[PDB]
Design a protein around this motif. Structure first.
Motif, PDB file in Angstrom:
ATOM      1  N   UNK A  16      -2.748  -7.686  -4.724  1.00 29.93           N
ATOM      2  CA  UNK A  16      -2.830  -8.263  -6.077  1.00 29.93           C
ATOM      3  C   UNK A  16      -1.640  -7.822  -6.960  1.00 29.93           C
ATOM      4  N   UNK A  17      -0.923  -6.758  -6.635  1.00 30.22           N
ATOM      5  CA  UNK A  17       0.062  -6.154  -7.586  1.00 30.22           C
ATOM      6  C   UNK A  17       1.490  -6.230  -7.038  1.00 30.22           C
ATOM      7  N   UNK A  18       1.660  -6.296  -5.726  1.00 31.80           N
ATOM      8  CA  UNK A  18       2.980  -6.487  -5.113  1.00 31.80           C
ATOM      9  C   UNK A  18       2.876  -7.629  -4.083  1.00 31.80           C
ATOM     10  N   UNK A  30       0.856  -1.205   0.000  1.00 30.94           N
ATOM     11  CA  UNK A  30       0.000   0.000   0.000  1.00 30.94           C
ATOM     12  C   UNK A  30       0.891   1.254   0.000  1.00 30.94           C
ATOM     13  N   UNK A  31       1.947   1.292   0.793  1.00 27.25           N
ATOM     14  CA  UNK A  31       2.880   2.437   0.844  1.00 27.25           C
ATOM     15  C   UNK A  31       3.619   2.549  -0.490  1.00 27.25           C
ATOM     16  N   UNK A  33      -5.264   2.418  -9.712  1.00 30.47           N
ATOM     17  CA  UNK A  33      -6.062   1.162  -9.794  1.00 30.47           C
ATOM     18  C   UNK A  33      -5.373   0.087  -8.934  1.00 30.47           C
ATOM     19  N   UNK A  34      -4.059  -0.015  -9.032  1.00 33.59           N
ATOM     20  CA  UNK A  34      -3.259  -1.041  -8.315  1.00 33.59           C
ATOM     21  C   UNK A  34      -3.259  -0.752  -6.815  1.00 33.59           C
ATOM     22  N   UNK A  35      -3.277   0.525  -6.440  1.00 37.67           N
ATOM     23  CA  UNK A  35      -3.316   0.975  -5.029  1.00 37.67           C
ATOM     24  C   UNK A  35      -4.638   0.602  -4.351  1.00 37.67           C
ATOM     25  N   UNK A  36      -5.701   0.447  -5.112  1.00 37.91           N
ATOM     26  CA  UNK A  36      -7.019  -0.016  -4.642  1.00 37.91           C
ATOM     27  C   UNK A  36      -6.927  -1.465  -4.151  1.00 37.91           C
ATOM     28  N   UNK A  69       0.118  11.325 -16.493  1.00 36.12           N
ATOM     29  CA  UNK A  69      -1.295  11.291 -16.089  1.00 36.12           C
ATOM     30  C   UNK A  69      -1.795   9.839 -16.139  1.00 36.12           C
ATOM     31  N   UNK A  70      -1.233   9.012 -17.021  1.00 40.75           N
ATOM     32  CA  UNK A  70      -1.630   7.585 -17.190  1.00 40.75           C
ATOM     33  C   UNK A  70      -0.986   6.788 -16.060  1.00 40.75           C
ATOM     34  N   UNK A  71       0.211   7.182 -15.650  1.00 37.70           N
ATOM     35  CA  UNK A  71       0.881   6.493 -14.512  1.00 37.70           C
ATOM     36  C   UNK A  71       0.087   6.737 -13.235  1.00 37.70           C
ATOM     37  N   UNK A  72      -0.487   7.919 -13.080  1.00 35.18           N
ATOM     38  CA  UNK A  72      -1.319   8.185 -11.882  1.00 35.18           C
ATOM     39  C   UNK A  72      -2.469   7.184 -11.903  1.00 35.18           C
TER      40      UNK A  72
END
Ligand SMILES: C=CC(=O)Nc1cccc2c1ncn2C
Length: 306
Positions: free
Chosen positions: A278-280, A113-114, A271-274, A263-266
């Motif tokens: 699932x992503x890390x 999350x961090x 989405x991954x931060x939600x 802007x796309x990286x944000x």
């Protein structure tokens, strides 16, 4: 041609602030009391040493100029300058230091999350810089500061340049350059754009995801251009899903316009931060935990000027 830059450069009296202790060597930790405001603002004071180098003073005032012209929660806040024998830059104190040292020091306590939230905040800061037609040219984990573990800001505008009315790219001529963070077009032709900054963002994210590993460790900088031309790139960090690594890889495409926009990286990191797990994939992610008279203390973020 361009909009006028109406930022305010505040000149501060040496008597308005007290150096409490030294942070590096010459940055100090101190407190700033604006004259008759009844507030104390934790500050970092960058004071030049030699003071007899005209070159050094021109470089410091260029940084002052750029930092005065930015106002964003994810970009370092300049409070003012002091014109003593030694020119002092007065900035918001970022008490946890640079993110590179923070991820090395706290590897065992940093959850997904961090990390993904830092990716979003750096992307927001960089997107803001692009909106101001500003190219940073030195984005790296060392150049991101930690106000709190929840809140980081881009710093070090030493290399930052402002594209002209018609200036898509920036051309430079020599000095000490951070090869290992640089886009191929920057190393070959000294071309720097918002898209070259995206390359450096990719490398910065690689540093966070490896908890502060050195990119291309033990490879000479003269070698780096050859390695990239051959199509080699930094390896997939152990904690990274292909989802996260693929975004890094897209930042390292030879065609600058093929790289993602800030802007796309944000958007992609948000989405991954939600759903960070699932992503890390980090061992023990679920247990991860991070943080005279102070009566009138106010952080710089709550200290606003007209
Ligand atoms: C232990 C804290 C520390 O080292 N902080 C800092 C270091 C460098 C620049 C810093 C800083 N805080 C604000 N700035 C500009």
């Amino acid at each position: 041609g361009e909009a006028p830059n109406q930022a305010l450069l505040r000149i501060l009296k040496e008597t308005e602030f007290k150096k409490i202790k030294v942070l590096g060597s010459t940055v100090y930790k101190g407190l700033w009391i604006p004259e008759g405001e009844k507030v104390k603002i934790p500050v970092a004071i960058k004071e030049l040493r030699e003071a007899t180098s005209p070159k050094a003073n021109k470089e410091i005032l260029d940084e002052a100029y750029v930092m005065a012209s930015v106002d964003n929660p994810h970009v370092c806040r300049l409070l003012g300058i002091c014109l003593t024998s030694t020119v002092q830059l007065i900035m918001q104190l970022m008490p946890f230091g640079c993110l590179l040292d923070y991820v090395r020091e706290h590897k065992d306590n940093i959850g997904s999350q961090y990390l993904l939230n830092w990716c979003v905040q750096i992307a927001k800061g960089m997107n803001y810089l692009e909106d101001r037609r500003l190219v940073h040219r030195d984005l790296a984990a060392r150049n991101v500061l930690v106000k709190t573990p929840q809140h980081v800001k881009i710093t070090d505008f030493g290399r930052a340049k402002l594209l002209g009315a018609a200036a898509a790219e920036y051309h430079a001529e020599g000095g000490k350059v951070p090869i290992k963070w640089m886009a191929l077009e920057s190393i070959l032709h000294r071309i720097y754009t918002h898209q070259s900054d995206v390359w450096s963002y990719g490398v910065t994210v690689w540093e966070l995801m490896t908890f502060g590993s050195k990119p291309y460790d033990g490879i000479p900088a003269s070698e780096i251009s050859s390695i990239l031309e051959k199509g080699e790139r930094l390896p997939q960090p152990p904690i990274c899903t292909i989802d996260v690594y693929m975004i890094m890889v897209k930042c390292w495409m030879i065609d600058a316009d093929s790289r993602p926009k800030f802007r796309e990286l944000i958007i992609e990191f948000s989405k991954m931060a939600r759903d960070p797990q699932r992503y890390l994939v980090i061992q023990g992610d679920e247990r991860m935990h991070l943080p005279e008279d102070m009566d009138d203390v106010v952080d710089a973020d709550e200290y606003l000027i007209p």
